[PDB]
Amino acid sequence: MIEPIKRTQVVTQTIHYRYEDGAVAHDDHVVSLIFTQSGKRDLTNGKEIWDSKWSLTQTFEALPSPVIIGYTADKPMVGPDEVTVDSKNFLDKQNREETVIYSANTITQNKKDGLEHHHHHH
Numbered sequence: 001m002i003e004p005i006k007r008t009q010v011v012t013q014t015i016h017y018r019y020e021d022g023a024v025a026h027d028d029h030v031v032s033l034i035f036t037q038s039g040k041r042d043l044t045n046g047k048e049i050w051d052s053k054w055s056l057t058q059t060f061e062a063l064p065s066p067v068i069i070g071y072t073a074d075k076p077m078v079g080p081d082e083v084t085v086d087s088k089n090f091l092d093k094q095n096r097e098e099t100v101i102y103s104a105n106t107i108t109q110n111k112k113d114g115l116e117h118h119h120h121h122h
Contacts, residue, residue, distance in 0.1 A: 055086030
């Protein structure tokens with residue numbers, strides 16, 4: 001006989017909203033994505049057979065950024081990417097902390113960022 005088991009990792013990233021002055025808009029805005037490696041347990045030996053190829057994708061998004069007057073965030077959307085946590089990196093976290101920087105608005109600023117944000121085409 002077998003029983004259903006699972007490893008449950010969460011990628012817990014703490015977004016620190018700050019300005020270019022270094023002033024803290026809000027330090028503790030913490031997102032978590034739940035990655036669940038389901039396995040199965042042999043009851044006879046007691047051994048736990050986790051799927052070593054198990055790789056779950058989860059869209060890192062849904063973390064906002066307060067639109068501040070005369071300010072432009074460095075990232076107004078924190079990590080816009082479908083991040084896959086697989087069995088090899090499963091037990092480790094990958095993301096821990098963010099720090100967005102609200103600098104003076106692009107009204108009074110030249111395009112310091114304009115390298116075209118490289119995302120997945122698939």
